[PDB]
Amino acid sequence: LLPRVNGTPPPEVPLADIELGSLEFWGRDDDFRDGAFATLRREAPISFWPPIELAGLTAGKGHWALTKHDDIHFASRHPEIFHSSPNIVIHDQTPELAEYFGSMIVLDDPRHQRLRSIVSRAFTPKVVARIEASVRERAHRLVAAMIENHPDGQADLVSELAGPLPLQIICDMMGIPEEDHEQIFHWTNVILGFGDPDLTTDFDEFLQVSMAIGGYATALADDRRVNHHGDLTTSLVEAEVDGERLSSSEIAMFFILLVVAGNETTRNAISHGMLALSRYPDERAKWWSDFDGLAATAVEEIVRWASPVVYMRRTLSQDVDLRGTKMAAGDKVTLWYCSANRDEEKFADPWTFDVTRNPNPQVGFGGGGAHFCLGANLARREIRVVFDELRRQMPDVVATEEPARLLSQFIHGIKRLPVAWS
Ligand code: HEM
C-alpha cells in the first residue's frame, strides 16, 4: 500500500518519548519502534524499564534492555551468568507450567544439555529426509490451494499460507493424522492467542486446551512405543543418550514448545518477508532472476529484517558490569534481537533490505550459544521453499494493503496481510 524507499532511516525518536513498559508504545508502527531502539543504541544502550502492566493483575519487576549486538552476543555466550530459568519472557503468567510449555528453552545446563542432546539424536537422516519432503509438499499444496480457492486473485497470506505451513510441517514430522489437524490447530491458536490482548482469551479455556494437547501428545508417544513408524515421535521414544531416555511427558512438553516456538516464528518470517519483497520490488526481481543462487543470502536477510522473535529474557545469577552499567544478581535482562539486527556498529547500511547482504551476522535465531535455535536451518528451508513455490505458481504475488499488526512485545506478528496475484 504505502510506498517505501529502500534504505530509509527511521524518524528521530526522542529518549523522553520511549516507554518500553507501556502497551501504547508497542502499538506503534515499525518506524517508531526502530527509531526508538536506534535512539537507545546511541544514547542509552543498556537501560532499566518497568514491565507492561495490564490494569488488574500483577506485572512483576523490571528488566535491563540490551540493545547492542555485542551485548546480546556476550549475554548469549555466558549462560552461567544469564540464566534461561525460570523462563525466557519478561513475566511468566503461569510459572508452575514454565517447564510444561517451555521444555528445553527454559532449562539451564546440565538439565538443558541432556534434554537437547536426546532430542537432537531423534532427528535421524530418515526423519530429516521426510521433513524436507514435507516442506516442499506442504508449501506446494498450500500455494496451489490459494489459486483454486480464490478465482478473484486475492487472499490473506497469513490464513492461507504463512499460518498453516509451519504447523502442518510440525504435524507431519510428529506423524499426526490429517483428521487430527482441526484439534491441533484450534488448541495451538488458543495458546498463541492467550497472550494477545486484542482477543479475549478465557484463562480457564487456556488451561483446558493446554492439557488436551499435552494428553494428545503423550498418547501419541505411547502409541509409537508399540507401533514403530518413520516419524519424529517414534524416534523420540527410541532416542537414548548416555543411558537416558525421554518420557511421554517430556515429549509432550517438547511438542508444545514446537507448536509455539517453531510455528509463529516461521509464520511471521514469511509474512514480513513477503512485505519486504513487496515494499522493495527490486529485491524480489533480483531473487526471482536467480533464486537458487541468492536463496541463502535472501533467507538470511529476511530473518534479519523480520526478527520474528523480538526479544528473549534472561535472569542474572551474579552481578554484571557491561558498558559502565552495573546490573545486580536476580535482575531480569532482555536481549532485543530487533535492535541488534539494526546495530550500526555491526551492519553496514542497516536500513537497506538487501537479499544479497554479505556478511550477515544476524541474530534472529538468537545470539548463538547453548540455546541457539534448534530448527534454524529448518526455518531457513521453510522460508526458501515457500517463496520458491510462490515464484513458480504466482510470480507476481504482492501485498496490496498495510499489514494488520499483532500487539505483542515478544512476537513481531502480522495478523492479516492481503496479497494479490494474476
Ligand atoms: C524464523 C524462524 C525462527 C526464529 C526467528 C526462531 C527464533 C528462536 C530464538 C531467538 C531462539 C532462542 C535463541 C537463544 O535463546 O539463544 C530459539 C530457540 C529454539 N527454537 Fe527457534 N526460531 C525459528 C524457528 C524454529 C523452528 C522451525 C523450530 C523447530 C522446528 C524451532 C525450534 C526451537 C527450539 C527447540 C528452541 C530452543 C532450543 C534451546 O533452548 O536450546 N525454531 N528460536
Which stretch of DSSP H or E encloses residue 59?
none
The label of the residue with cell 522473535 reads 309
Q: Where are the alpha helices (DSSP H) in 262-312?
A: 264-279, 281-289, 291-306
Q: Verify whether ligand 1 is closer than 6 Å to residue 161 (CB atom).
A: no
Peptide bond into 14 cis (omega under 30): no
Please say whether the beta carbons of 152 and 410 come within 8 A.
Answer: no
CB-based contacts of 223: which residues, under 8 Å, 6+ apart?
none
CA atoms of 106 and 100, how far apart (whole Å) = 10
Closest Cα to atom 40 of ligand 1: 105
CA atoms of 26 and 94, how far apart (whole Å) = 23
In DSSP notation, 169-188 reads: HHHHHTT--GGGHHHHHHHH
Crossing angle of helices 281-289 and 291-306, rounded to 10°: 150
Method: X-ray
Give this entry's resolution in angstroms: 2.2
- CA 360 to chain centroid, in Å, comes to 18
Q: Verify whether ligand 1 is closer than 6 Å to residue 374 (CB atom).
A: yes
Q: Verify whether ligand 1 is closer than 6 Å to residue 106 (CB atom).
A: no
Q: What are phi and psi of 302, to 5 degrees?
A: -60, -40
C-alpha distance from residue 328 to each of 21, 76, 368, 389 (Å)? 20, 17, 24, 50
* Nearest residue to 382 (alpha-carbon basis) of 122, 127, 139, 176: 139
Atom number, ligand 1, closest to the C-alpha of residue 371:
41
Nearest-10 Cα torsion for 274, 133, 176, 158 = 10
CA atoms of 378 and 176, how far apart (whole Å) = 19
Nearest-10 Cα torsion for 99, 101, 105, 108 = 0
Instruction: Please give the single-letter amino acid code of residue 263.
Output: N
Peptide bond into 359 cis (omega under 30): yes
Provide the β-strand partners of residue 418: 156
Task: Please tell me whether 371 is known to bind a ligand.
Answer: yes
**∠ CA(299), CA(305), CA(310), 5° rounding?**
115
Q: Verify whether ligand 1 is closer than 6 Å to residue 72 (CB atom).
A: no
How far is ligand 1, taken at its centre, from the CA of residue 95, in Å? 21
Q: Is the dihedral of CA 376, 378, 379, 383 positive or negative?
A: positive
CB-based contacts of 44: which residues, under 8 Å, 6+ apart?
15
CB-based contacts of 231: which residues, under 8 Å, 6+ apart?
127, 130, 172, 173, 174, 175, 224
* Nearest residue to 316 (alpha-carbon basis) of 307, 324, 328: 328
Q: Verify whether ligand 1 is closer than 6 Å to residue 173 (CB atom).
A: no
Q: What are phi and psi of 395, to 5 degrees?
A: -65, -25
CB-based contacts of 9: which residues, under 8 Å, 6+ apart?
38, 351
Please say whether the beta carbons of 323 and 42 come within 8 A.
Answer: no
Q: Domains (ranges, CATH) in the chain?
A: 1-422 (1.10.630.10)
The label of the residue with cell 526455518 reads 379
Q: Where are the alpha helices (DSSP H) in 164-243?
A: 164-173, 181-193, 203-226, 232-238
Strand 63-66 with 332-336, pairing = parallel
Task: Please tell me whether 116 is known to bind a ligand.
Answer: yes
Q: Grid coordinates standing for 103?
A: 521444555
Please say whether the beta carbons of 333 and 316 come within 8 A.
Answer: yes
Q: Is the dihedral of CA 405, 407, 411, 415 positive or negative?
A: negative
CB-based contacts of 183: which residues, under 8 Å, 6+ apart?
212, 213, 216
Closest Cα to atom 19 of ligand 1: 373
Q: Where are the alpha helices (DSSP H) in 67-198?
A: 69-76, 98-102, 111-122, 125-149, 157, 164-173, 181-193
